[PDB]
Amino acid sequence: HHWGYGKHNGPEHWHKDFPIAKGERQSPVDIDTHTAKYDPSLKPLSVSYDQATSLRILNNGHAFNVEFDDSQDKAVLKGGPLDGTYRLIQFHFHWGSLDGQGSEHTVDKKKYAAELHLVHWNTKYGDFGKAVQQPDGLAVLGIFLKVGSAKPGLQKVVDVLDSIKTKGKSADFTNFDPRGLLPESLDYWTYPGSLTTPPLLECVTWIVLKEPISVSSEQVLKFRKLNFNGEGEPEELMVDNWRPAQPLKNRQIKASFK
Ligand code: NI
């Protein structure tokens, strides 16, 4: 029926409605650190989020999105392997039912407890909708989360989850600064890939940070309290909303570091 992460509508079934699921540039992938090529020509990433305007947080039924005003060049990403300016539209997370799983990308087969995705679209295309139809239309910054120390900058997010418990619920979420979620180092891996939920379009240049951020057990615990279902429907906890690693096929993972 409609796609999800259950046994009957999970990742293994998506190909029936979205044939691109078996495409040549599907995400996520496992990052083999010994095979990634250091590429000296990659520039350092440029993250300018000081003018970021968050507006709302929403439970869309598969995750929670924090949305930003993208009507102007307020929060942009550039540099790295990118040509042009990419505007931040939203961020969200993929997480697990246990601390030993939850990330989409893996490193040398290691899975993290969660993965943060900062989604940006190429301003040359004029809007998000047009950007997803192009090979270089989006840039997603991926950050791994490991369980250890609490992340102060994530707490505001954790605290509003009770108010968007079920699908379709939203809440005003202004004045949130996404700089509080960045690790210290911007070293990264990059490869051409796709969206990880239907429609699975192959329009993403992925930028995955080598350094994870730490969150506390209690913090990740609150994520696991969300529901996939709408209000008044039987309760289904929003857990394991991650797609497993896909074949690399004809692609090279480039590293910005050695
Ligand atoms: Ni994602």
With beta carbons less than 8 A apart as the criterion, state whether 55 and 68 touch: yes
Residue 16: CB partners within 8 Å, gap ≥ 6?
Answer: none
For residues 133-146, b (16+ Cβ closer than 10 Å) or e, as one string? eeebbbbbbbbbbb
Ligand 1: centre distance to CA 63 (Å): 9
Q: What is the DSSP letter of 235?
A: P
Ligand 1: centre distance to CA 234 (Å): 25
* HSE toward the beta carbon, residue 95, CA cutoff 13 A: 25
Binding residues for Zn(2+): 92, 94, 117
Whether a cis peptide bond, with omega within 30° of 0, leads into 11 is no
SS3 content of the chain, % helix, strand, coil (to 5): 15, 30, 55
Give yes or no: 34 in active site: no
Return d(Cα 112, Cα 105) in angstroms, integer: 9
Catalytic residue among 15, 62, 105, 120: 62
Return d(Cα 150, Cα 212) in angstroms, integer: 13
Q: Which of 112, 179, 110, 189 is nearest to 151 (CA)?
A: 179
Per this entry, what is the length of the chain?
A: 258
Whether a cis peptide bond, with omega within 30° of 0, leads into 199 is yes
**Considering just the CA atoms, what is the radius of gyration of the chain in Å?**
17
Per-residue 3-state assignment (H helix, E strand, C coil) for 194-207: CCCCCCCCCCEEEE
Enter the resolution in angstroms: 1.9
Whether a cis peptide bond, with omega within 30° of 0, leads into 28 is yes
Phi, psi torsion values for 113, nearest 5 degrees: -75, -20
Q: In CATH, what number does 1-258 get? A: 3.10.200.10
Ligand 1: centre distance to CA 42 (Å): 24
Q: What residues have their beta carbon closer than 5 A to ion ligand 1?
A: 117
Ligand 1: centre distance to CA 61 (Å): 13
Task: Please state, in angstroms and as integers, the Cα–Cα distance from residue 139 to each residue in 6, 81, 93, 154, 186, following that order.
Answer: 28, 10, 16, 22, 15
Q: Which of 85, 90, 93 is nearest to 136 (CA)?
A: 85
Q: What is the DSSP letter of 15?
A: G
The Cα angle at residue 64 between residues 59 and 70, in degrees rounded to 5: 105
3-state SS class at 213:
strand
